[PDB]
Design an enzyme around this catalytic site. Structure first.
Site, PDB file in Angstrom:
ATOM      1  N   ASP A  96       0.973  -1.223   0.118  1.00 45.70           N
ATOM      2  CA  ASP A  96       0.156   0.004  -0.008  1.00 45.70           C
ATOM      3  C   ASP A  96       0.844   0.997  -0.073  1.00 45.70           C
ATOM      4  O   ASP A  96       2.119   1.147   0.419  1.00 45.70           O
ATOM      5  CB  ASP A  96      -0.858  -0.015   1.406  1.00 45.70           C
ATOM      6  CG  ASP A  96      -2.136  -0.928   1.172  1.00 45.70           C
ATOM      7  OD1 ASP A  96      -2.980  -0.836   0.447  1.00 45.70           O
ATOM      8  OD2 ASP A  96      -1.836  -1.848   1.570  1.00 45.70           O
ATOM      9  N   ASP A 125      -3.423  -3.303   7.140  1.00 47.44           N
ATOM     10  CA  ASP A 125      -3.830  -2.785   8.469  1.00 47.44           C
ATOM     11  C   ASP A 125      -5.139  -3.131   9.191  1.00 47.44           C
ATOM     12  O   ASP A 125      -5.341  -3.165  10.330  1.00 47.44           O
ATOM     13  CB  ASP A 125      -3.850  -1.234   7.912  1.00 47.44           C
ATOM     14  CG  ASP A 125      -5.029  -0.758   7.403  1.00 47.44           C
ATOM     15  OD1 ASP A 125      -5.402  -1.296   6.246  1.00 47.44           O
ATOM     16  OD2 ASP A 125      -5.883  -0.090   7.724  1.00 47.44           O
ATOM     17  N   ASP A 168      -8.312  -7.107   5.243  1.00 42.88           N
ATOM     18  CA  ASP A 168      -6.994  -7.833   4.621  1.00 42.88           C
ATOM     19  C   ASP A 168      -6.785  -9.165   5.340  1.00 42.88           C
ATOM     20  O   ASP A 168      -6.015  -9.772   5.103  1.00 42.88           O
ATOM     21  CB  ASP A 168      -5.692  -6.905   5.102  1.00 42.88           C
ATOM     22  CG  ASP A 168      -5.870  -5.567   4.134  1.00 42.88           C
ATOM     23  OD1 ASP A 168      -6.154  -5.542   3.260  1.00 42.88           O
ATOM     24  OD2 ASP A 168      -5.746  -4.564   4.755  1.00 42.88           O
TER      25      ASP A 168
END
Ligand SMILES: *[C@@H]1O[C@H](CO[C@@H]2O[C@@H](C)[C@@H](O)[C@@H](O)[C@@H]2O)[C@@H](O[C@@H]2O[C@H](CO)[C@@H](O[C@@H]3O[C@H](CO[C@H]4O[C@H](CO)[C@@H](O)[C@H](O)[C@@H]4O)[C@@H](O)[C@H](O[C@H]4O[C@H](CO)[C@@H](O)[C@H](O)[C@@H]4O)[C@@H]3O)[C@H](O)[C@H]2NC(C)=O)[C@H](O)[C@H]1NC(C)=O
Ligand SMILES: *[C@@H]1O[C@H](CO[C@@H]2O[C@@H](C)[C@@H](O)[C@@H](O)[C@@H]2O)[C@@H](O[C@@H]2O[C@H](CO)[C@@H](O[C@@H]3O[C@H](CO)[C@@H](O)[C@H](O[C@H]4O[C@H](CO)[C@@H](O)[C@H](O)[C@@H]4O)[C@@H]3O)[C@H](O)[C@H]2NC(C)=O)[C@H](O)[C@H]1NC(C)=O
Ligand SMILES: CCCCCCCC/C=C\CCCCCCCC(=O)OC[C@H](COP(=O)(O)OCC[N+](C)(C)C)OC(=O)CCCCCCC/C=C\CCCCCCCC
Ligand SMILES: CCCCCCCC/C=C\CCCCCCCC(=O)OC[C@H](COP(=O)(O)OCC[N+](C)(C)C)OC(=O)CCCCCCC/C=C\CCCCCCCC
Ligand SMILES: CCCCCCCC/C=C\CCCCCCCC(=O)OC[C@H](COP(=O)(O)OCC[N+](C)(C)C)OC(=O)CCCCCCC/C=C\CCCCCCCC
Ligand SMILES: CCCCCCCC/C=C\CCCCCCCC(=O)OC[C@H](COP(=O)(O)OCC[N+](C)(C)C)OC(=O)CCCCCCC/C=C\CCCCCCCC
Ligand SMILES: CCCCCCCC/C=C\CCCCCCCC(=O)OC[C@H](COP(=O)(O)OCC[N+](C)(C)C)OC(=O)CCCCCCC/C=C\CCCCCCCC
Ligand SMILES: CCCCCCCC/C=C\CCCCCCCC(=O)OC[C@H](COP(=O)(O)OCC[N+](C)(C)C)OC(=O)CCCCCCC/C=C\CCCCCCCC
Ligand SMILES: CCCCCCCC/C=C\CCCCCCCC(=O)OC[C@H](COP(=O)(O)OCC[N+](C)(C)C)OC(=O)CCCCCCC/C=C\CCCCCCCC
Ligand SMILES: *[C@@H]1O[C@H](CO)[C@@H](O[C@@H]2O[C@H](CO)[C@@H](O)[C@H](O)[C@H]2NC(C)=O)[C@H](O)[C@H]1NC(C)=O
Ligand SMILES: CC(C)CCC[C@@H](C)[C@H]1CC[C@H]2[C@@H]3CC=C4C[C@@H](O)CC[C@]4(C)[C@H]3CC[C@]12C
Ligand SMILES: CC(C)CCC[C@@H](C)[C@H]1CC[C@H]2[C@@H]3CC=C4C[C@@H](O)CC[C@]4(C)[C@H]3CC[C@]12C
Ligand SMILES: CC(C)CCC[C@@H](C)[C@H]1CC[C@H]2[C@@H]3CC=C4C[C@@H](O)CC[C@]4(C)[C@H]3CC[C@]12C
Ligand SMILES: [K+]
Ligand SMILES: [K+]
Ligand SMILES: [K+]
EC number: 7.2.2.13
Lengths: 993, 294
Positions: A346, A687, A691
């Site tokens: 990311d 985070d 995910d």
């Protein structure tokens, strides 16, 4: 737990009506369910609680580690020892207890190694528990027309449920009536975007519509009502948690490598064993002798100390990683990083610093630059127009962040601000050239504010006007420049107002692309004076219906801001490209900015081009160019929402630099599952909970540490503590480093197996006195060789590791045939010859010449022959000749240590020379010194003839192995030389590990 | 997999390589192992040059001599029936093997045998341990010296009627001079009578105090009629310097042995450079478990 029916994309009954849903669940829209019916369903469907995981007791896997290749061979060794003892105890009186001791010890070795493997195969997983901490304890349900707060587990399908800003959605609902209700779908969308829930339907995709609340989310603001459509393991978060807990673990690369060599080692062990056992009885050997043989051969072949060495080696490198800020949960993840060839990272909070500063501003058809330097040493931006004042009021008012209490001392830029980085950057710029915002804010009381909405894509509010001569109402709103551009009809030019003709609309488009191409994020600010005649000073504009004119606003100007990159980001990207790791940028900002950040960090190498870039350079349509001439590409999220599987496979199979913008971190998992499919190890950076299914199925999940949530970190395999990206590169390097060392240590431990196997083999073929006992072996593999093998891990790199391509799993291995050709074929042979040399020397000096030793075993072992003639005619009793054989075992063991010196030195480096690398490894030096001190201690300490059967040596013997050691050193030195001069030749494809 | 990795027909590979690979690897290993063998042989030849042919460099692991016997007992036990003849055959075959080397036909002429004192005498030094003088000369030891255990009269040697014999022998050591205990007030009880200085005494007894009574009359036979070894047969010059050398022997008849009962008899030699060991039960002494079950 059908996984395929859980892998499919969610379906629903959203596209329905309010009448069509109560019938499906038997309910009332104004009265809800009845208590009797509610309990009848509560008993029909089950509780609204995620099912607990299936578990694994601990004595099961400990008992599993006790049975595995090396342990079965050692087990049959213990069994054989007790068999020979039983035979002795039933056949002879006064049976020495040597065999029972050797057996109890072998069983101890197996039991302790098991512990080292248990430590290595840990699986600390408490997923479902983290999910269970999710659902509030009690929900608000309406039954028989009354409001009651009941245990959430007691909610069923059909009753009416009311929610309020701050409470967690207890189940999947179908909104029936809302009042400015907003939810936080961070768990499915991956975004903290406040999506509003409206009773009306708006999208064919159930995840995009607003008439559905989802378990695992929270109502940020407002209140709403709804019917329960899904509860328990059937909610959305239910398939997320059940899918996370369900994924079969599997077997890490290093594990597959450890299996491959136990297979080879066992191969040579059974080949030598079954064969010599048949040979022993083809030569007339009795049963109590063959059992001793079998044992000696099994111990000789099994490296009783290896596996525990590997477990330590890996533990040392994990401590080094924790020093470099990378904490690893599972021991083997230390190696999975090196074998990685694909990363899904990311941009927000990892590559970038997220600390935002106001860079550029648009107003009066003119770009203005602001000072973005720490000590504020630059150029002002002309604070003399009214436009700027209106801009200051818009930004300073339509902003909820405020400096942290007690910062009256630090400077305006270094103080702490509680809020997002955008509101913080705006607050700092206004507080910088517009004075105290706290008074600017109390100078205009905020009446009503409509927070940011994922659908509205804007933040608006109506405050009072400080104007003493104009008692009207002020409305301000900020948001994406496109959305705000669609909501205006006037432009505040130099103070006065003007229409929005296409001339300024095009100047606004060029300004948008100017600030966007600069790698900055732009925002639009507009305001409007509400007519006090249609909205008096007493009227209250409750945030429910259209009380403010969304359109016909007055756009004042754009406001950009800077997010610079981290120090090592460009270097890290270069390191990844040098190694061959396919990096993939996935973020959530605009592609016009995404392209700039891509060019700024390396993803889009200076020279590569996209299909649109080619169409722009050749001013031709995009449908004409061929997609093979474009190296990179920007894939939009919406186009990702509508894409098939094979298409994604081709997307990853045909492009080297892919960037995903406008992506909702759900899709992320899709991209990860597409990266693993082609045949590459995959890592990911996350985070939150969206995910979770992506980190679990990835070969290695890298979770953030400071900004990450308990769920994401507890479900990942590696945790980062500084949230940096350079640590990922450091992890990959350390994963390689600990690999080449394992190869060296394995060749080390193996090489000494030959000098232990050969004495036994000559014992049966030539009939000479036993050269190396079994207790001496265990004293070699469990004693003198452990410390050096452990030290081989501290070896530094030889060349550049972060430059070669990732190792192939289907062709390159850890233990190939080249190593076998070196340890078992060349070095080990020389060590065995040296041992036999010292042997014959000891016997020749005491009276037994080499010509008379062949054929003597039958009488050399005979316990009742007290007259054995030697080469000179002397008569030797039984115990006297046995003492000499034991002294020959002691010197054989010392010869092993002497040759191990040169083996540890030639094993230190695989290609480079010793005069280049250098002996800077203090642990290896300490290993040699200790290895020698232990041998001297075991031989010279009094009473060692009662315990280990090792007699003192005469100072002239210790020098019988020196020439063999120097020869080993010279041979390997010339070996590691032709490889350097002749790359790709015979010595390389034959002896280069 | 299974079939391909064994034999493919496009690359003409067997097990993985072609004919030229197997040939290069085989040639390399042959040259490597050949060099290894030549080096080991050279380092062993220098070793043959480092030792002497007339004397062992280290003689400390054989300092206190052993005490062996003629019968071959598996567990130091002599058990046989006085009726069944196929019971003491394994014993006689051994006894005979030992005495078969003292045949007079073997000992004949001046070379290399020499007639020595028929009565115990002192040491005899035939020079140093060199090749200057030719093959040294050893004293003759006649069979007949052993009176009732010689296999010349009663081939069986005793085992036929409950009166077995046991030929004891001192382990041959190069340059070893036997030294008997002197006549001073400290000497065992047994040794006082018949103190021929020139004789190394051998005396058997019972391990336990009880067994004394059950053991009858230990009748020893030897050179001069004494129960020992004459010092004239020492020292030993080694095989190379004294082939055809005979070591003295002492016969022991265990007459009047109780029938049907295990008797533990420990024989022991006495002397200065003689020391026993609690670990080696054959260093200076020896144990026998006789049981004449009939
Ligand atoms: C050292 O001396 C050994 C004994 O020497 C004898 O006595 C000395 C004092 C001299 O007088 C010498 O001249 C004597 O020979 C000597 O061993 C002897 O060797 C001979 C020749 O083989 C043996 O004669 C054979 O005897 C068997 C049966 O033996 C029985 O008794 C013995 C015990 O004595 C048992 O062990 C056996 O199992 C038997 O129970 C006869 O069957 C055999 O027949 C052969 O001869 C006849 C003619 O006589 C032929 O018709 C046949 O076809 C056969 O060819 C022999 O008569 C004698 O048994 C044996 N003595 C002992 C005690 O074993 C030994 O070899 C000498 N060694 C050296 C290195 O000099
Ligand atoms: C080794 O040692 C023994 C013992 O020696 C004696 O004891 C030692 C520890 C030490 O103190 C010596 O000084 C000491 O002599 C030797 O054998 C001994 O020899 C003497 C002499 O023949 C014997 O004494 C005799 O005892 C008889 C009764 O027991 C007695 O009737 C004898 O009379 C003879 O002597 C008298 C004078 O005293 C004379 O008038 C008679 O006419 C007759 O000759 C005599 O006193 C001892 O009993 C002996 N000891 C034993 C144990 O038998 C032995 O000879 C010696 N061997 C060698 C090779 O040196
Ligand atoms: C008295 C006796 C005393 C003896 C004392 C010495 C003790 C013994 C010492 C060592 C034992 C050696 C045992 C054999 C070791 C072979 C190693 C082995 O099997 O490793 C496995 C490898 C796999 O490797 P990979 O994964 O990289 O493959 C990748 C293939 N991909 C990628 C193309 C798919 O498979 C391969 O190598 C293919 C298999 C090749 C097998 C060769 C067999 C040779 C064995 C004996 C020869 C003897 C002849 C003697 C006569 C000479 C003439 C004079
Ligand atoms: C006949 C008997 C046969 C015996 C056969 C077995 C032999 C095996 C035992 C010992 C072999 C010794 C081999 C000697 C090799 C010396 C190599 C050497 O000196 O290379 C020099 C290196 C290179 O430096 P650079 O240019 O990279 O520096 C750059 C510095 N910058 C970065 C600041 C610019 O310098 C360095 O490594 C730094 C200094 C390191 C000094 C090491 C000294 C310790 C050496 C051996 C320890 C003894 C072990 C004894 C074991 C017996 C126990 C009883
Ligand atoms: C950085 C960290 C540094 C740490 C370094 C640590 C180094 C430790 C250094 C020394 C400690 C050694 C242990 C002390 C042993 C004392 C044994 C003792 O005083 O024995 C005296 C008596 C002998 O009496 P005697 O002469 O009358 O016997 C006559 C027997 N006849 C006549 C029948 C043959 O013993 C007997 O009888 C029975 C003998 C009992 C055998 C005990 C030996 C233990 C066996 C193996 C353990 C060694 C493992 C290695 C550990 C390495 C650590 C580095
Ligand atoms: C880097 C670290 C260095 C330190 C590691 C140490 C180096 C050695 C490592 C492993 C050696 C294991 C080999 C096992 C040998 C057992 C020998 C045995 O059992 O011989 C049987 C004897 C026979 O006696 P007997 O009945 O004839 O006595 C009669 C006495 N009368 C008659 C006077 C009463 O019995 C006896 O000696 C009884 C005493 C039993 C001796 C147990 C010794 C255990 C040795 C090691 C275990 C701990 C190692 C842990 C370190 C791991 C490092 C990673
Ligand atoms: C690349 C490979 C490297 C190998 C390095 C090996 C290092 C070896 C280290 C020490 C060697 C062992 C010590 C030898 C001690 C022997 C003690 C002894 O009792 O000896 C006696 C025998 C002579 O007996 P005889 O029957 O002729 O007496 C007849 C007397 N009458 C005439 C009066 C009748 O002596 C002899 O055999 C002596 C014959 C020895 C010949 C071998 C020479 C070894 C080579 C070098 C030694 C290292 C020194 C230099 C170090 C350099 C460091 C960089
Ligand atoms: C007590 C223990 C003593 C141990 C002493 C051991 C000494 C023995 C050492 C070496 C003897 C082995 C020599 C073997 C020569 C025949 C090998 C052969 O037939 O090779 C053919 C190749 C040429 O084919 P190519 O590559 O052009 O074809 C390309 C082929 N395609 C395309 C498949 C890649 O040969 C090449 O490459 C050239 C490579 C030649 C190999 C050099 C290895 C040298 C290693 C050690 C010598 C140092 C001894 C130091 C001792 C000091 C003692 C104090
Ligand atoms: C895979 C692992 C292999 C491990 C190798 C183990 C090596 C040992 C193997 C077998 C040992 C057998 C016993 C050796 C004795 C040979 C006897 C001999 O030969 O007695 C002839 C001469 C002695 O003459 P003399 O009459 O003056 O002595 C005394 C004169 N008196 C007494 C009258 C004064 O002895 C001489 O000259 C020197 C002869 C010394 C014998 C060395 C022969 C070794 C053969 C091959 C080793 C190479 C292995 C390479 C690895 C191959 C793997 C496939
Ligand atoms: C041999 O042992 C026997 C005993 O087995 C001794 O003879 C016995 O003597 C006692 C008197 O002390 C008599 O009562 C027995 O009847 C005798 N038994 C036999 C079988 O004769 C004999 O004196 C011993 N002889 C020797 C030389 O020791
Ligand atoms: C005691 C003696 C006679 C045994 C000698 C065994 C020798 C000849 C054995 C032991 C190990 C063996 C080698 C071990 C490994 C390899 C690699 C493989 O890809 C081809 C065979 C090859 C090259 C073997 C050839 C034969 C070899 C060298
Ligand atoms: C560097 C390496 C390869 C050289 C090895 C040389 C080998 C082959 C040499 C060194 C010493 C030599 C041996 C030394 C001693 C003897 C004794 C003699 O009566 C016959 C020759 C014989 C048996 C030699 C045969 C060849 C030999 C073993
Ligand atoms: C470079 C190479 C060829 C040199 C090899 C040297 C060899 C021949 C040397 C090195 C060490 C030496 C041995 C070392 C130890 C002993 C023990 C001693 O009590 C007698 C000599 C003896 C048996 C030596 C004989 C010769 C020897 C083996
Ligand atoms: K081993
Ligand atoms: K995972
Ligand atoms: K080993």
């Amino acid at each position: 737990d059908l996984d395929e029916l859980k892998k499919e994309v969610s379906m629903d009954d959203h596209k329905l009506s309010l009448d069509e849903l109560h019938n499906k669940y038997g309910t009332d829209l104004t009265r809800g369910l009845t208590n009797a019916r509610a309990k009848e369903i509560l008993a029909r469907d089950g509780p609204n609680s995620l099912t607990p995981p299936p578990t694994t007791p601990e004595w099961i896997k400990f008992c599993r580690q006790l049975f595995g290749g090396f342990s079965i061979l050692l087990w049959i060794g213990a069994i054989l020892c007790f068999l020979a003892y039983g035979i002795q105890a039933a056949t002879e009186d006064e049976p020495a207890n040597d065999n029972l001791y050797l057996g109890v010890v072998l069983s101890t070795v197996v039991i302790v190694t098991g512990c080292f493997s248990y430590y290595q195969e840990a699986k600390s997983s408490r997923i479902m528990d983290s999910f269970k901490n999710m659902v509030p304890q009690q929900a608000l349900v309406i039954r028989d027309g009354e409001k009651s707060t009941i245990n959430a587990e007691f909610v069923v399908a059909g009753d009416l449920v009311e929610v309020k800003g701050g409470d967690r959605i207890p189940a999947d609902l179908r909104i029936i009536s809302a009042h400015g209700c907003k939810v936080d779908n961070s768990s499915l969308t991956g975004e903290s975007e406040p999506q509003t829930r409206s009773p009306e339907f708006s999208s064919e995709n159930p995840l995009e519509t607003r008439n559905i609340a989802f378990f695992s989310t929270n109502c940020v603001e407002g209140t709403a009502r709804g019917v329960v459509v899904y509860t328990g393991d059937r909610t959305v978060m239910g398939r997320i948690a059940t899918l996370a807990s369900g994924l079969e673990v599997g077997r890490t690369p290093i594990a597959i490598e450890i299996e491959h060599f136990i297979h080879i080692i066992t191969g040579v062990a059974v080949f030598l064993g079954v064969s010599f056992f048949i040979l022993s009885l083809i030569l007339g050997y009795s049963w109590l002798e063959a059992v001793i043989f079998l044992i000696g051969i099994i111990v000789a072949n099994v490296p009783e100390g290896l596996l525990a060495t590997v477990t330590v080696c890996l533990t040392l490198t994990a401590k080094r990683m924790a020093r470099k800020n990378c904490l690893v949960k599972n021991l083997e993840a230390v190696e999975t990083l090196g074998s990685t060839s694909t990363i899904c990272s990311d941009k927000t909070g990892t590559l970038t610093q997220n600390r935002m500063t106001v860079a550029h501003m648009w107003f009066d058809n003119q770009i203005h630059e602001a000072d973005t330097t720490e000590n504020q040493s630059g150029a002002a931006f002309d604070k003399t127009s009214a436009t700027w004042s209106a801009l200051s009021r818009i930004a300073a008012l339509c902003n909820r962040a405020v400096f942290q209490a007690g910062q009256d001392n630090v400077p305006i830029l270094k103080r702490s601000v509680a809020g997002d980085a955008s509101e913080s950057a705006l607050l700092k710029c206004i507080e910088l050239c517009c004075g105290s915002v706290q008074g600017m804010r109390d100078r205009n009381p905020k009446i009503v504010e409509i927070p940011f909405n994922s659908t509205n894509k804007y933040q608006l509010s109506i405050h009072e006007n400080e104007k003493s001569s104009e008692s009207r109402y002020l409305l301000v709103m900020k948001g994406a420049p496109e959305r705000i551009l669609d909501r205006c009809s006037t432009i505040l030019l130099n103070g006065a107002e003007e229409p929005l003709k296409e001339d300024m609309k095009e100047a606004f488009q060029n300004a948008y692309l100017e600030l966007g191409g600069l790698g900055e994020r732009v925002l639009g600010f507009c305001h409007f004076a509400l007519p006090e005649d249609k909205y008096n000073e007493g009227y209250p504009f409750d945030a429910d219906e259209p009380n403010f004119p969304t359109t016909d606003l007055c756009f004042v100007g754009l406001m950009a801001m800077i997010d610079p990159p981290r120090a090592a980001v460009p270097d890290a990207v270069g390191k990844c490209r040098s190694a061959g790791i396919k990096v993939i940028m996935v973020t959530g900002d605009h592609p016009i900015t995404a392209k700039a950040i891509a060019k700024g960090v390396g993803i889009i190498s200076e020279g590569n081009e996209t299909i649109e870039d080619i169409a722009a350079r050749l001013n031709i349509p995009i449908g004409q160019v061929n997609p093979r001439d474009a190296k990179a590409c920007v894939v939009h999220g919406s186009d990702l929402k509508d894409l098939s599987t094979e298409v994604l496979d081709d997307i990853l199979h045909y492009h080297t630099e892919i960037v995903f913008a406008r992506t909702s971190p759900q899709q992320k998992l899709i991209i990860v599952e597409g990266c693993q499919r082609q045949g590459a190890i995959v890592a990911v950076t996350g985070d939150g909970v969206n995910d979770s299914p992506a980190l679990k199925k990835a070969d290695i999940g890298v979770a953030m540490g400071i900004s990450g949530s308990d769920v994401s970190k507890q479900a990942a395999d590696m945790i980062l503590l500084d949230d940096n990206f350079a640590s990922i590169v450091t992890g990959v390097e350390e994963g390689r480093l600990i690999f080449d060392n394992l190869k060296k240590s394995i060749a080390y431990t193996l090489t000494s197996n030959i000098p232990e196997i050969t004495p036994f083999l000559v014992f049966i073929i030539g009939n000479v006195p036993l050269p190396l006992g079994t207790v001496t072996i265990l004293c070699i593999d469990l004693g003198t060789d452990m410390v050096p093998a452990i030290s081989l891990a501290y070896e530094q790199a030889e060349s550049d590791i972060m430059k070669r391509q990732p190792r192939n799993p289907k062709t390159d291995k850890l233990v190939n045939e080249r190593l076998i050709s070196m340890a078992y074929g060349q070095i080990g042979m020389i060590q065995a010859l040296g041992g036999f040399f010292s042997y014959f020397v000891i016997l020749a000096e005491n009276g037994f010449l080499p010509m008379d030793l062949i054929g003597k075993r039958v009488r050399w072992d005979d316990r009742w022959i007290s007259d054995v003639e030697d080469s000179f005619g002397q008569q030797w009793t039984y115990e006297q000749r046995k003492i000499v054989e034991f002294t020959c075992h002691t010197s054989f063991f010392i010869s092993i240590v002497v040759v191990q010196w040169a083996d540890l030195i030639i094993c230190k480096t695989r290609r480079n020379s010793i005069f280049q690398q250098g002996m800077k490894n203090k642990i290896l030096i300490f290993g040699l010194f200790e290895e020698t001190a232990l041998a001297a201690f075991l031989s010279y300490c009094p009473g060692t003839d009662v315990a280990l059967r090792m007699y003192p040596l005469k100072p002239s013997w210790w020098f019988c192995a020196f020439p063999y050691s120097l020869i080993i050193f010279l041979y390997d030195e010339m070996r590691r030389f032709i490889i350097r001069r002749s790359p790709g030749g015979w010595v390389e494809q034959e002896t280069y590990y | 997999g299974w079939k391909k990795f064994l034999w493919d027909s496009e690359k003409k590979e067997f097990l993985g390589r072609t004919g030229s690979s197997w040939f290069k690897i085989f040639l390399f290993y042959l040259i490597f192992y050949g060099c290894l063998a030549g080096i080991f042989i050279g380092t062993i030849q220098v070793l043959l040059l480092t030792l002497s042919d007339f004397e062992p460099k280290y003689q400390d692991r054989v300092a206190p001599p052993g005490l062996s016997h003629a019968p071959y007992a598996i567990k130091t036990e002599i058990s046989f029936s006085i009726s069944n003849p196929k019971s003491y055959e394994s014993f006689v075959k051994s006894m005979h093997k030992l005495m078969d080397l003292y045949n007079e036909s073997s000992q004949a002429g001046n070379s290399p045998f020499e007639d020595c004192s028929d009565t115990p005498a002192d040491y005899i030094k035939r020079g140093d341990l060199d090749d200057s003088q030719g093959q040294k000369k050893a004293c003759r030891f006649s069979r007949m010296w052993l009176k009732n255990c010689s296999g010349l009269d009663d081939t069986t040697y005793g085992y036929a009627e409950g009166k077995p014999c046991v030929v004891a022998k001192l382990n041959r050591i190069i340059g070893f001079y036997p030294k008997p205990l002197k006549n001073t007030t400290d000497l065992p009880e047994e040794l006082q009578a018949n103190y021929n200085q020139y004789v190394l005494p051998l005396r058997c007894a019972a391990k336990r105090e009880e067994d004394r009574e059950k053991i009858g009359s230990i009748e020893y036979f030897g050179l001069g009629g004494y129960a020992g070894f004459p010092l004239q047969y020492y020292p030993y010059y080694g095989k190379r310097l004294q082939k055809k050398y005979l070591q003295p022997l002492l016969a022991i008849q265990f007459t009047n042995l109780t029938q049907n009962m295990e008797l533990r008899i420990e024989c022991k030699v006495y002397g200065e450079n003689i020391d026993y060991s609690e670990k080696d039960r054959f260093r200076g002494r020896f144990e026998v478990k006789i049981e004449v079950k009939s």
